[PDB]
């Protein structure tokens, strides 16, 4: 009772690639953002618009629609910042030392220093981006990883359906590596390497969430009602 399980590996890849959200632009007419208000203002506005695309992206992830509405809510609530971050890290892959939040918004270490306790997440994000490029992460692998995050991150806060969809994404990841001519040993080693990254992406999300919670209490940057609800879902 799920069309997701019946798909072939290529059907799975094709569905994920076509479900990809677009790369959104930040606000124009810029000063290079240097105030804690203007930078977080730009980022909050960007993340807010990205979330709308993510929600409709999630509905196009095979197996996600089979879940009850409440289960869909829980997964997105848990994983939304993880997904934004791995998206950010993926975009910043061809730009070492810099973070491409948007094509017209590239930030480095020095602008992270702007916000009190912000450069540490930056370094973690930059490190993850460097890690992706050294691994030569492919777009087909990236969309698999992102879907895994969506289905995995909130699975133990509730169920065989998700695990069987997760198993199939693994089948897809291996299928991609085998197609690229990787040996059997190179396949499971790379699979392990990719999945261990998710542990750090999870860590970056948790540290980021605490920071956003701090910004809410600071009440200097106005958060949208949507982000407030996504934020409140954690603590």
């Amino acid at each position: 009772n799920s069309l997701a399980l019946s798909l072939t590996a290529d059907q799975m890849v094709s569905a994920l690639l076509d479900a990809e959200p677009p790369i959104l632009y930040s606000e124009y007419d810029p000063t290079r953002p240097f105030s804690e208000a203007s930078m977080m203002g730009l980022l909050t506005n960007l993340a807010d618009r990205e979330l709308v695309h993510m929600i409709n992206w999630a509905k196009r992830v095979p197996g996600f629609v089979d879940l009850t509405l409440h289960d869909q809510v829980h997964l997105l609530e848990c994983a939304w910042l993880e997904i934004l971050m791995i998206g950010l890290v993926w975009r910043s892959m061809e730009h070492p030392g810099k973070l491409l939040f948007a094509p017209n918004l590239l930030l480095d270490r020095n602008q992270g220093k702007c916000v009190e306790g912000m450069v540490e997440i930056f370094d973690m994000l930059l490190a993850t981006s460097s890690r992706f490029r050294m691994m030569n992460l492919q777009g087909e692998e990236f969309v698999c990883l992102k879907s895994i995050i969506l289905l995995n991150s909130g699975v133990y806060t509730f169920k065989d359906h998700i695990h069987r969809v997760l198993d199939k994404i693994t089948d897809t990841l291996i299928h991609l590596m085998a197609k690229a001519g990787l040996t059997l040993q190179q396949q499971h080693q790379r699979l392990a390497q990719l999945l261990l990254i998710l542990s750090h992406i999870r860590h970056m999300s948790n540290k980021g969430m605490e920071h956003l919670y701090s910004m809410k209490c600071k009440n200097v940057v106005p958060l949208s009602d949507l982000l407030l609800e996504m934020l409140d879902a954690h603590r």
């Binding site: 809510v73 009602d225 609800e229």
Partner: peptide, 9 residues
């Protein structure tokens, strides 16, 4: 929640 409404669309 807003998230409810957006997932139904």
């Amino acid at each position: 929640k807003i998230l409810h409404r957006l997932l139904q669309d």
